[PDB]
């Protein structure tokens, strides 16, 4: 643990500070030295780990966007062959993307999940679980048939969670069907799946809007746009 | 590629 | 050298991928490697050696003020003093900062400069050491007189060389004169200077443009505006 | 800071 010595309030400071310094690397290492100190995480600290990954992961999922769609081109007929650069360049992004993910997955599994018993926090990181092996499934190959399932069945597990103890306005729970949705459309290739699980959860938000304050209204109905964006662009 | 929207910062 | 196993030639086709991937730490030790093989740099390969470190120390600096900021409202009078963890992280990220300042410094002289025999080399690389000084010069509180002694000194022996070799629309004479002048105004405290320097600059190229193409007049007049975008704040 | 234009990107 390179930030074993540092103290739990301290590496949270930090992150907070890199969070508004755009230095999400640091803000990802400051929040895995967090949870390596084996308390549970509060909802404030919970988000601040997804900020920092989805940052840090969102750049290399650019990047290899850019260099996969470099590589196909090569690969065209008719290209001329620069040799096993873009390949290989392309490769190194995907392998430092690989482990960024397998790093999250890492402090999932060891021991998010199991000390997680309350809703709004085990939805949050099996939500998180289906994320990651979801950016590993858009980078797959070879064995992407596990990889999938995982994602499948950890976002199922958290949907189960969610529409048990959560209401249809959770910002939680309308995060993880958003994320749920994009998996079948582009993942498992479910796009009728995709649409009937978007429509059906902005449909059961959107008639328990009412029993929301303001500001809960307002969180919500940013999430439900999401899929609205989506099922436009779907249908 | 199309990105379609999911949770949280891009 | 991270870098030795790999083709010059390989080092500056991934250099070229990662600009387009948005990997500017990538491109920088790509560059690095490529300039450690020990041959010259073409146009080309010094344009994508400063872009590469441009970047990467453009969002250091950009962090280090945020931190520089956030610490010293810390330390107005009022405040409740969080404890050493501003300070100790403004401090990592000028660690690094400087280091990639030091990096770069280290290729100029070792050995980029000595071998820099044409006017558009070696006024590049001196208007860079002066850059990279003046980076330094902006988080220095210490020994900071001789920095920017080294920055000006850069500076200076770039613009002598540029004055008598390069005519006065040269986009690489405009951008050195642009950078000294903000040196002038900020780091050594020469507003009168600054000012003086970018008004010549900027009415000594407008009356050479008429001899310019096309092309060559975007390139000149696209500085030439920086120099007036700064006049304007200034006066 | 209010920062001025110096060459290149930022
Ligand atoms: N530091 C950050 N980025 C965040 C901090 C918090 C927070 C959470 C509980 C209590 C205090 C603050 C966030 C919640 C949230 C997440 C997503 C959308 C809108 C709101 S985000
Ligand atoms: N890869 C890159 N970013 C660049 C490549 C080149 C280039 C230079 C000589 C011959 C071919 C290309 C640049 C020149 C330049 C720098 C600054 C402003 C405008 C233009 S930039
Ligand atoms: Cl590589
Ligand atoms: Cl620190
Ligand atoms: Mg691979
Ligand atoms: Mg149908
Ligand atoms: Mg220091
Ligand atoms: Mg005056």
């Known amino acids: ?235 | 590629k199309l990105m379609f929207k999911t949770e949280g910062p891009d």
């Open chain 1, 1 to 235: 643990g390179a930030m074993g010595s540092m103290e739990r309030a301290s590496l949270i400071q930090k992150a907070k500070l890199a969070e508004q310094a755009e230095r999400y690397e640091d803000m990802a290492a400051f929040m895995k030295g967090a949870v390596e100190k084996g308390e549970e995480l509060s909802c404030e600290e919970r988000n601040l780990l997804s900020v920092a990954y989805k940052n840090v992961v969102g750049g290399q999922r650019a990047a290899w966007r850019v260099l996969s769609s470099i590589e196909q081109k090569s690969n065209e007929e008719g290209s001329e062959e620069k040799g096993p650069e873009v390949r290989e360049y392309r490769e190194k992004v995907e392998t430092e993307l690989q482990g960024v993910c397998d790093t999250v997955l890492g402090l999932l599994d060891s021991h998010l999940i199991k000390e997680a018993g309350d809703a709004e926090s085990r939805v949050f990181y099996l939500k998180m679980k289906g994320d990651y092996y979801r950016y590993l499934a858009e980078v797959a190959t070879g064995d992407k048939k596990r990889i999938i399932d995982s994602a499948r069945s950890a976002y199922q597990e958290a949907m189960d969670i969610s529409k048990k103890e959560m209401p249809p306005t959770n910002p939680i729970r309308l995060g993880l069907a958003l994320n749920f949705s994009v998996f079948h459309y582009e993942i498992a290739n479910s796009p009728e799946e995709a649409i009937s699980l978007a429509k059906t959860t902005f449909d059961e938000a959107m008639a328990d809007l009412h029993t929301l304050s303001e500001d809960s209204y307002k969180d919500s109905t940013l999430i439900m746009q999401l899929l609205r964006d989506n099922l436009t662009l779907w249908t």
